[PDB]
Amino acid sequence: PAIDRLLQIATGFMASKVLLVAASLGLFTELAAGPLRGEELRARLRLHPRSARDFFDTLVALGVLERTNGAYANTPATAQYLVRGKSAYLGGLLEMSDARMYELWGRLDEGLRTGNPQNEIDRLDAFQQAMTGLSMRSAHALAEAIDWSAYRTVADIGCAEGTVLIHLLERHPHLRGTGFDLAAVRPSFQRRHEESGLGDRLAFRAGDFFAEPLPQADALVFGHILSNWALPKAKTLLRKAHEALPEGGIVVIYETLIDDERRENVPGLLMSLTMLLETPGGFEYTGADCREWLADAGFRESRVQYLAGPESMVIATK
Amino acid sequence: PAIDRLLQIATGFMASKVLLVAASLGLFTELAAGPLRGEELRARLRLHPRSARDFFDTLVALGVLERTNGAYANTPATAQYLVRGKSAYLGGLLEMSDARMYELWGRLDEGLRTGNPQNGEEGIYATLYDDPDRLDAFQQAMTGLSMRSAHALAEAIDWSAYRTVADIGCAEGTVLIHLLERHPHLRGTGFDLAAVRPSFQRRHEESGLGDRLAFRAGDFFAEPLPQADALVFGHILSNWALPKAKTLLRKAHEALPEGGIVVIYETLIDDERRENVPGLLMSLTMLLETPGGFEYTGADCREWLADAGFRESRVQYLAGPESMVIATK
Ligand SMILES: C[S@@+](CC[C@H](N)C(=O)[O-])C[C@H]1O[C@@H](n2cnc3c(N)ncnc32)[C@H](O)[C@@H]1O
Ligand SMILES: C[S@@+](CC[C@H](N)C(=O)[O-])C[C@H]1O[C@@H](n2cnc3c(N)ncnc32)[C@H](O)[C@@H]1O
């Protein structure tokens, strides 16, 4: 029935919490060495004997854990994506949802009634690990979705620790890259930079993009940037991208974009409510919204293109 | 789409909260008289313009609202089951999840680490000042959602060999009343704490069962159980620690005549403890809500029944996530 599906959505916070706590405990990382029986897994996770077995079996029943002859083990998906240290690890997103977003979303009604965020308005490394997991599939797709051989240089605006840019340059040996972010991010960028071995091919530029021009490059990337800010400041960033680009250069913007008709992309619409809860004036937008802003900024051509999972990009040519 | 399935589960708290808040706002009730535009619905709910349309459009994208030419409307399910005032209203489940259970599950980690329930700081009588209309709506929904299993309990057993039935911890008596309506030969007794009698009496009066049904005030951990040919335990044993569950089975055996039956129903976990998500989640609910409760399997229960001296037990599916275990003295 339609009502059974409706109630399953309504009570989805229970199974969500089961998986979020398992991620917070690093349960899947503890199983990366091999299968463990319930008593051993409980001891490693420091869980109480009352409900540990129920907890593990719930994960099995949800399809996010294997159990064979009394030993729990990762599924192919949890092995690939929820084991810490692996390149495709996105568990940082679940750890952040468990530590912060679950309780923040508990304040949705107040956000809806006031229109004001419901948050405070390590730590940095927690935010960066959540962002890496959010942008993980999109960063790989970004390296394949555009013919990068046509550009010499790329500047990632709001680059954080530089994961997207580093993968782009590793994937395309000809590229030179510049990451742009606040000065407090430089150490995290410098660490990833040194670990990549990319050397002189990659550089960091410290600054505030609401007070300083952007680095000049053949391509400029905006990953999960514009959705954080009220529309006039996003329009300011699009103008600065135009000024930083040469003729034929491109601006690339990717988000969990809402469908143009605003009736299908659930992660995008949910993201817009996260922006409500987290920011004074951010919101999630549609590809059509962005193409209007880009034409207004002076770009001559633009298209919307699917990326990965719920995320999409808008590309414009100066 | 394997990782996409996992991410849908892990972030299900968001879609949940959207629906839970829509229920606490009575959004679907506001749409009962007919479709409303965004600004009209916004104003009727006293929501800020910044995110009202995003909220409304999320519900459309989840498939719980319709939108035609900019007019938001109930889907057939929300119009039937999420409009306050209707006898079929189930929104009390969402209201109570929003008001209470969502935050409770926020403490799952502490419950798993401590083994202790997670459910003083406020003033005197704080607990007594909860929204009684929301509490009533929640109970109305649990009464309704249980009707399938009450229908099944009446049909799964040949009740003709038994004269009398007692429901132990009967609460408002819904199952016992339905069984008596379906099998008019049965005389019935509901057994529960004295404070439960008003809610039972209301259902008793509404049923017309009259002289064929009685309520008996009692504490089943402190007094003998009513003697009847059949004893029913609906969602009782799972609320209590194992020594107490065994104690109740012993008292059932003592209360029953030779040939009498004990009838237990629960959201049982599958015997292999790997399939039944409602049952496993219920066991974690018991962690968070009770000091000693636990969900169990049919096989677990048949062992306790054999140890209590019962004969000829079996496990039988009832309806949806509910199953019964029945045994003969
Ligand atoms: C949501 S994170 C996005 C990280 C990355 N682009 C991605 O998609 O995963 C936003 C980034 O913008 C940066 N940022 C915020 N305000 C900034 C400012 N005023 N100037 C430069 N960078 C800023 C933050 O440091 C943060 O790393
Ligand atoms: C799960 S609720 C009842 C559910 C009911 N059997 C049904 O399925 O609709 C547990 C019931 O046991 C009753 N109860 C709890 N402790 C009791 C006690 N010590 N003696 C008698 N009844 C008790 C409560 O009042 C409550 O009605």
Residue numbers in the entry:
A (entry chain A): 12 to 132, 148 to 344
B (entry chain D): 12 to 130, 135 to 344
The authors write:
The movement is an approximate 12° rotation toward α11 about an axis aligned with α15, where the loop regions around α15 act as flexible hinges. Helix α11 accommodates this conformational change by developing a kink at M157 or S161 with 31 to 49° changes in the Phi and Psi angles at these residues. The overall length of the monomer is reduced by 2.5 Å and the central binding cavity volume is reduced by up to 60% (estimated via POCASA), and likely represents a closed conformation of RedM. This conformation is seen in two protomer chains of the RedM-SAM structure: chains A and B. They adopt slightly different closed conformations with an average Cα displacement of 2.5 Å, rotating toward the dimerization domain about an axis roughly parallel with helix α8. Chains C and D have more open conformations similar to the unliganded and SAH-bound RedM structures. Upon closure of the active site, residues F153 and M157 from the interdomain helix α11 are brought to within 4 Å of the SAM methylsulfur, displacing the solvent. The two chains in the asymmetric unit of the RedM-SAM complex adopting closed conformations have higher B-factors along the periphery of the Rossmann-like domain compared to their dimer partners and corresponding weaker crystal symmetry contacts. In docking the substrate to the closed conformation several poses remain in this distal area, but higher-scoring poses occur near SAM.
